[PDB]
Design a protein around this ligand. Structure first.
Ligand SMILES: Nc1ccc(C(=O)O)c(O)c1
Ligand SMILES: [Ca+2]
Ligand SMILES: [Ca+2]
Ligand SMILES: [Ca+2]
Ligand SMILES: [Ca+2]
Ligand SMILES: [Ca+2]
Length: 435
């Protein structure tokens, strides 16, 4: 009965964000619904040899949602999902959003310790994973949960065994009996994001439909997505970068197509890019270097690339200038965080801006503060600590009142720990990290 707890925006701000059009109080399923009404047959996801249209995605995620509601799973409940970069990931995501289950998506590289900390935290009633994952190769992990009354009520397995509940079986056919189900309220938690750079296990970040949808819609505008965008998803699908800035959600919002790749392996990525004429991709600097090493020998397979998003680490100007030259495509530099703030160079910015800065905030109502150790605003140009608050920046970690009072100040600015400086053109440059 009780919806998931989280820290809220002040009503004064919540009104402002509604008045400005940022929060439109719609569930994240809006992306699916709106898509099925306009272009039900456009391809939504390409995965290997499979072609999922928008209405194909809608029907499949409904089948799963009706069977979860049939089992009594809905509002108030949580789910732990750990799937690889395949179409099933997005079916599950939209299926849980439809059913009102707050999902935490672990990284497919997370091992037993991390998954254990997540379960002890959200106490999920549903667990979706892969039998091909090391943790679910045997039954030791699933068994250890019973000893601590943390075992879930429903466990679905991809690449399942005869005994297991086949995830693909629950997706193909809907349930026999009818049960009503609905998303959580737009201004309530939709799912959990995972912090990056956390010393211990990643901390939980509650994302509501209102704020996440906004970052998706705004990211899509600044990154130029449209119904012809074919975006390669080579990074980990659950990551904020690959999902919402602009990510798969931004592409679907624009009526485009998501092309799945197991990882950013140059040769495989290059082949997928040529096969499906991928015209956009999003990478971290380490993967870009991998692509740069192989590009010259495979210029033809990657001709169709039109725009590359690079963010998430140091990207020196000497590397930036190689993207257009070697990868034959435009460069967009970004700097974001799962906690909220997302920065991007604009597609019309100068070459000096694109090649030596990480852009500027998505929202004109993103409030930025650059301070020193005496928590005072530094003179424009100098390096300082980044504090921010906006219409898509969280207001505190899940069930972490001690930590939250350390990273949030009285005015509720969030201190990312990132060191930055504001260039004359107004753009930000990320120059280091602090702790
Ligand atoms: N747009 C982006 C880029 C990078 C990150 C990141 O935290 O790695 C993000 O959360 C958003
Ligand atoms: Ca099909
Ligand atoms: Ca559109
Ligand atoms: Ca090109
Ligand atoms: Ca060239
Ligand atoms: Ca951080």
């Amino acid at each position: 009965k009780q919806l998931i707890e989280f820290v809220r925006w002040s009503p004064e701000r919540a009104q402002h964000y509604r008045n400005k059009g940022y929060w439109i109080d719609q569930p994240l399923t809006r992306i699916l619904t709106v898509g099925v009404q306009s272009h039900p047959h456009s391809l939504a996801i390409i995965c290997g040899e499979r072609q999922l249209s928008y209405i194909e995605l809608d029907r499949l995620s409904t089948n799963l949602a009706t069977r979860l509601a049939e089992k009594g799973l809905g509002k108030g409940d949580t789910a732990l999902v750990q799937l690889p970069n395949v179409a099933e990931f997005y079916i599950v995501f939209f299926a849980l959003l439809k059913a009102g289950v707050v999902v935490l998506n672990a990284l497919y590289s997370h091992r037993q310790y991390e998954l254990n900390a997540f379960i002890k935290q959200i106490q999920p009633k549903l667990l979706i994973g892969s039998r091909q994952h090391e943790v679910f190769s045997n039954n030791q992990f699933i068994d250890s949960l019973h000893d601590v009354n943390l075992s879930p009520e429903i466990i679905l397995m991809l690449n399942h065994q005869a005994t297991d509940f086949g995830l693909l079986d629950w997706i193909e056919t809907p349930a026999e009996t009818f049960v009503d189900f609905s998303s959580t309220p737009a201004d309530e938690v939709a799912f959990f994001q995972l912090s990056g750079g956390s010393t211990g296990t990643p901390k939980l970040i509650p994302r509501t439909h209102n704020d996440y949808d906004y970052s998706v819609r705004a990211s899509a505008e600044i990154c130029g997505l449209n119904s012809n965008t074919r975006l390669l998803c080579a990074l980990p699908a659950p990551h904020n970068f690959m999902l919402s800035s602009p990510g798969a959600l931004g592409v679907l919002h624009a009526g485009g197509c998501v092309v799945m790749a197991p990882n950013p392996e140059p040769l495989n990525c290059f082949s997928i890019i040529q096969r499906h004429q991928v015209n956009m991709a999003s990478l971290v600097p380490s993967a870009v270097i991998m692509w740069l090493e192989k590009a010259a020998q495979y210029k033809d397979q990657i001709q169709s690339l039109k725009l590359l998003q690079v963010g998430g680490a140091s990207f020196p100007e000497s590397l930036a200038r190689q993207v257009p030259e070697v990868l034959n495509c435009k460069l967009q530099q970004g700097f974001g965080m799962a906690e909220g703030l997302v920065n991007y160079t604009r597609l019309d910015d100068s070459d000096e801006q694109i090649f030596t800065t990480q852009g500027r905030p998505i929202s004109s109502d993103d409030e930025i503060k650059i301070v020193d150790e005496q928590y005072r605003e530094v003179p424009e140009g100098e390096i300082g600590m980044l504090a921010t608050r906006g219409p898509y920046t969280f207001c505190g970690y899940y069930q972490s009142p001690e930590h939250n009072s350390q990273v949030f100040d009285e005015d509720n600015y969030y201190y990312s720990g990132d060191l930055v400086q504001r260039t004359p053109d107004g753009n930000l440059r990320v120059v280091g990290r602090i702790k």
